[PDB]
Write a protein of this length. Structure first.
Lengths: 427, 551
């Protein structure tokens, strides 16, 4: 409730100070949008202009949600979140819906608007300071801090949990089979109803919420020809893993068996049960690469046995909710991108292959960006936690254009790595 | 005049306390000058006197202009500035003249002095206290504390810019058409009115400030092009940067090298290459401001590079938001790149060069990409939009790099310009092993303790080489082996290695490197017709790779 309710005391982690992240340059288009958005925000008293005595700063920018014409302010609160106390407010509680990923349909609704009603602790406000840039540095930036819970901040959901469940109570009873999980500013609503029956229950939920204060994104139309309504409407049923396989052809050259024993030697890091000796002793001799060396020496022995070992899940692999998920993406060529999520090296919880838009495409950053968001969304739906991405791109290439194709209201943690010759090891 | 504008609440870093530093007597002529200045600065309200329960102080100084027998107070704030809170610097670089549109009438006011007129938060005042000596140590001492933003203090620039903003707020909405850039000492005002109605708004604004204590010298007859703004000469359809000359002297003091870095940090933004590392480092310790510090071998070298850096005029035209933005890039050679950003042919907005990389192994197509990236960001900062690119590379050359390179990579929309030297990949490794070519099984190792090692190969035809090496590493030898195989090989060859380190270097298609070895390899690979690199793990006994080394 936006009523004059008392604020919840919030503190930063001990010994840690507020954020001091630089604002990246924005285009005139995004500046004008942020200006328009913020002039209204303060006009309603949700943000306030602040001076230079406030030393902190988080980066701000604009995007469009999937298929939208409306600019949406997005504040990169990654640092702030990192430095903010981990709220004990039902953290272990509401154990992630293991069935959410099992439903036929899952819509994602943006409820971040609810946050604009609960006041932010006056002492915490200074840490939510963001700056709107100026074209050519004409003027100093336009600075503001939040007077209310902000979208993108990890504590906004924590503090609102209490009145969120109270609004979801009537719905959850009337519809006992519908699963609802919330991550940051998003509501994940899944059912096993026919896609039409489902969309109906969503518009019902929207209206209910609407009757209790919070507004959600509208379901305007689906007239877009280039197929752009497949977003924010998930189908966890089709999510399949990617098996590690081996090649298969009649003739086998020396080279082939080297690019076979090699690949298998690495695979044995995951599955301790892969013998290589049979095929190594078959490679003895300083032979030519193009020399078609008979498959022999009982090669089909392990070659077909190890082919089997790659059909059983890894021993000792299970999700430990007490440690971050890590994600690696590999560029495979031809709009092909493979990935892996794991918490311990070689103990993959899920391997995959982002394939949508696998057509002849010109933009790698756009593709990887969309991949990162798909992998991030799947992690939310499966484990309810974003992973830390290891990106196959140069830091500067990525920072120059990622916000040009971003539509998520969250931003995961990422770093940059130089992919070695281990791409082919995922076909 | 002390402004009637709200003061910005300032604080000391948490835990820290005000400066306690005490100064030593200087000279009789100076201790007398200070008294006279301090009776001047106490007159208006800038500073005040206190000596009972103020337990802070800051070093004091009286210098002189090498033009007249006048001495002005320098107060050393280096101490207070260390215990004073950080302020956020709401500036992402400084304005660039090329980011200006043309205006029929332009005026530049002088607000250099306006900071002395902005009040200082009451509470933080007691920390700006300073006391001057006494002639022959007669009187106890003169304790003074500031009432306004002190010259040289840490938050002076930030609080003044902030105050100037609020003061201008009303005037900018009342006249939504005149543009007003404010960057410390200068105040650019430009409208598209005839000279006179513009001169009206000018005085109109010169009064609005006067109304808030900000007295701006009467020079609205600055309608006499060129106008000087931020170190730039703004002409009617052109702008030029006023050449900067760095003082070249014999001996240097702390105050001098400090003042030097100050103006260098300035030029570093208009001109690229200004490196201020070797110099700034000579500010170690709490050494008095006026104490000679000898410039090291790098300090004299760095001052020399900077000096030859800004030794020529920089010019350009203004921005026209109607026309598109075009940027063109040329390979200058030796890992150097040149570019021009213009809207109309030959009338450049901004020109420049780009500076390779801080790594080891690289490649032209890569170099070019980073260049495009730099321009894109710079353009968005200056104009707010990405420019169209004219690049010296075929659409076919890029398609090959964009598909065979394992890392996401992209370049905006571009047009190929047929001006040499064109950029291209100098060789491609084969995807499939070559039939008929001799297969070399290379390897090489080294003793970490003695740096002595060996590299060699063993081909299928029975050919075998083994060269001993002095002071090398496993990586060097592993590459050297790849080198042998490439010297002692025909036009076509197959190389099999156990070195993943090396596979990765050669597979990224470098055309220039820091390692002479790698370069020799590059030079060699270009001369071949078909090369094929293959990897296989080590200590697994594969192929003939296991039967290569003896030691």
């Amino acid at each position: 409730p936006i009523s004059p309710i008392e604020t919840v005391p919030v503190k930063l982690k001990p010994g840690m100070d507020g954020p001091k992240v630089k604002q990246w340059p924005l285009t005139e288009e995004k500046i004008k949008a942020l200006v328009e958005i913020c002039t209204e925000m303060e006009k309603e008293g949700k943000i306030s202009k602040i001076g230079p005595e406030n030393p902190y700063n988080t980066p701000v920018f604009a995007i469009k949600k999937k298929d939208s014409t409306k600019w949406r302010k997005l504040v990169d609160f990654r640092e702030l979140n990192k430095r903010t106390q981990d709220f004990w407010e039902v953290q272990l509680g509401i154990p992630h819906p293991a069935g959410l990923k099992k439903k036929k349909s899952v819509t994602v609704l943006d409820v971040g608007d609810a946050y604009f009603s609960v006041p932010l602790d006056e002492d915490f406000r200074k840490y939510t300071a963001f700056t709107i840039p100026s074209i050519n540095n004409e003027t100093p930036g336009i600075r503001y801090q939040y007077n209310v819970l902000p979208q993108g901040w990890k504590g906004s959901p924590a503090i609102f949990q209490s009145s969120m469940t109270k609004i979801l109570e009537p719905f959850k009873k009337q519809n006992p089979d519908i699963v609802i999980y919330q991550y940051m500013d998003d509501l994940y609503v899944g059912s096993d109803l026919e896609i039409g029956q489902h969309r109906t229950k969503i518009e019902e939920l929207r209206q209910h919420l609407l009757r209790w204060g919070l507004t959600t994104p509208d379901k305007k139309h689906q007239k877009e020809p280039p197929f752009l309504w497949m977003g924010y409407e998930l189908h966890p049923d089709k999510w399949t893993v990617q098996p590690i396989v081996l090649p298969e052809k009649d003739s086998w050259t020396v080279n082939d068996i080297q690019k076979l024993v090699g690949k298998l030697n690495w695979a044995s890091q995951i599955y301790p049960g892969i013998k290589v000796r049979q095929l190594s002793k078959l490679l003895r001799g300083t032979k030519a690469l193009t020399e078609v060396i008979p498959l022999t020496e009982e090669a089909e022995l392990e070659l077909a046995e190890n082919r089997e070992i790659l059909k059983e899940p890894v021993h000792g692999v299970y999700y430990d909710p007490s440690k971050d998920l890590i994600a690696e993406i590999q560029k495979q060529g031809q709009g092909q991108w493979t990935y892996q999520i794991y918490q311990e090296p070689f103990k993959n919880l899920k391997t995959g292959k982002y394939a949508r838009m696998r057509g002849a495409h010109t933009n790698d950053v756009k593709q990887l960006t969309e991949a990162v968001q798909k992998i991030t969304t799947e992690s939310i739906v499966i484990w309810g936690k974003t992973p830390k991405f290891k990106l196959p791109i140069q830091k500067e290439t990525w920072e120059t254009w990622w916000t040009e194709y971003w539509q998520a209201t969250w931003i995961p943690e990422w770093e940059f790595v130089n992919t070695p010759p281990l791409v082919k090891l995922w076909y | 005049p002390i402004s009637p504008i709200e003061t910005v609440p300032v604080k000391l870093k948490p835990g820290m306390d005000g400066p306690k530093v005490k100064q030593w007597p200087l000279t009789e002529e100076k201790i007398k000058a200070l008294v006279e200045i301090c009776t001047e600065l106490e007159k208006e309200g800038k500073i005040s006197k206190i000596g009972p329960e103020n337990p802070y102080n800051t070093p004091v100084f009286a210098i002189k202009k090498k033009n007249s027998t006048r001495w002005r107070k320098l107060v050393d704030f280096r101490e207070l500035n260390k215990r004073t809170q950080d302020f956020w610097e709401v500036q992402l670089g400084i304005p660039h003249p090329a980011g200006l549109k043309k205006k029929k009438s332009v005026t530049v006011l002088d607000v250099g002095d306006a900071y002395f007129s902005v009040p200082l938060d009451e509470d933080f005042r007691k920390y700006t206290a300073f006391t001057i000596p006494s002639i022959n140590n007669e009187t106890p001492g003169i304790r003074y504390q500031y009432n306004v933003l002190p010259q040289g203090w840490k938050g002076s620039p930030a609080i003044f810019q902030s105050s100037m903003t609020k003061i201008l707020e009303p005037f900018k909405k009342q006249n939504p058409d005149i543009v007003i850039y404010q960057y410390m000492d200068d105040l650019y005002v430009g409208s598209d009115l005839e000279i006179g109605q513009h001169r009206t708004k000018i005085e109109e604004l010169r009064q609005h400030l006067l109304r808030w204590g900000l007295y701006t010298p009467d020079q609205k007859h600055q309608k006499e092009p060129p106008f000087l703004w931020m170190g730039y000469e703004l002409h009617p359809d052109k702008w030029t940067v006023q050449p900067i000359v760095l003082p070249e002297k014999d001996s240097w003091t702390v105050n001098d090298i400090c003042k030097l870095v100050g103006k260098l940090n300035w030029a570093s933004q208009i001109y690229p290459g200004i490196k201020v590392r070797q110099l700034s480092k000579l500010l170690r310790g709490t050494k008095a401001l006026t104490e000679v510090i000898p410039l090291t071998e790098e300090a004299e070298l760095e001052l020399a590079e900077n000096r030859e850096i800004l030794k020529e005029p920089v010019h350009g035209v203004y921005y026209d938001p109607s026309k598109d933005l075009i940027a063109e890039i040329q390979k200058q050679g030796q890992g150097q790149w040149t570019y021009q950003i213009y809207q109309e042919p030959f009338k450049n907005l901004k020109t420049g060069k780009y500076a390779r990389m801080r790594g080891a192994h690289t490649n032209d197509v890569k170099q070019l990409t980073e260049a495009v990236q730099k321009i894109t960001t710079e353009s968005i900062v200056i104009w707010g939009k990405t420019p169209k690119f004219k690049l010296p590379i075929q659409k076919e050359t890029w398609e090959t790099w964009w598909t065979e390179y394992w890392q996401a990579t992209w370049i905006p929309e571009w047009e190929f310009v047929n001006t040499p030297p064109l950029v291209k990949l100098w060789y491609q490794l084969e995807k499939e092993p070559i039939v008929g070519a001799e297969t070399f099984y290379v390897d090489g190792a080294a003793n970490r303790e003695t740096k002595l090692g060996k590299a060699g190969y063993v081909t299928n035809k029975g050919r075998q080489k083994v060269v001993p090496l002095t002071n090398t590493t496993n990586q060097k030898t592993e590459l050297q082996a790849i080198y042998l195989a490439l010297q002692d090989s025909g036009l076509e060859v197959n190389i099999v290695t156990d070195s993943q380190y090396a596979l990765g270097i050669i597979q990224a298609q470098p055309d220039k490197s820091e390692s002479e070895l790698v370069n020799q390899i590059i030079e060699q690979l270009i001369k071949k017709e078909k090369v094929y690199l293959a990897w296989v793990p080590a200590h697994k006994g594969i192929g003939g790779n296991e039967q290569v080394d003896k030691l």
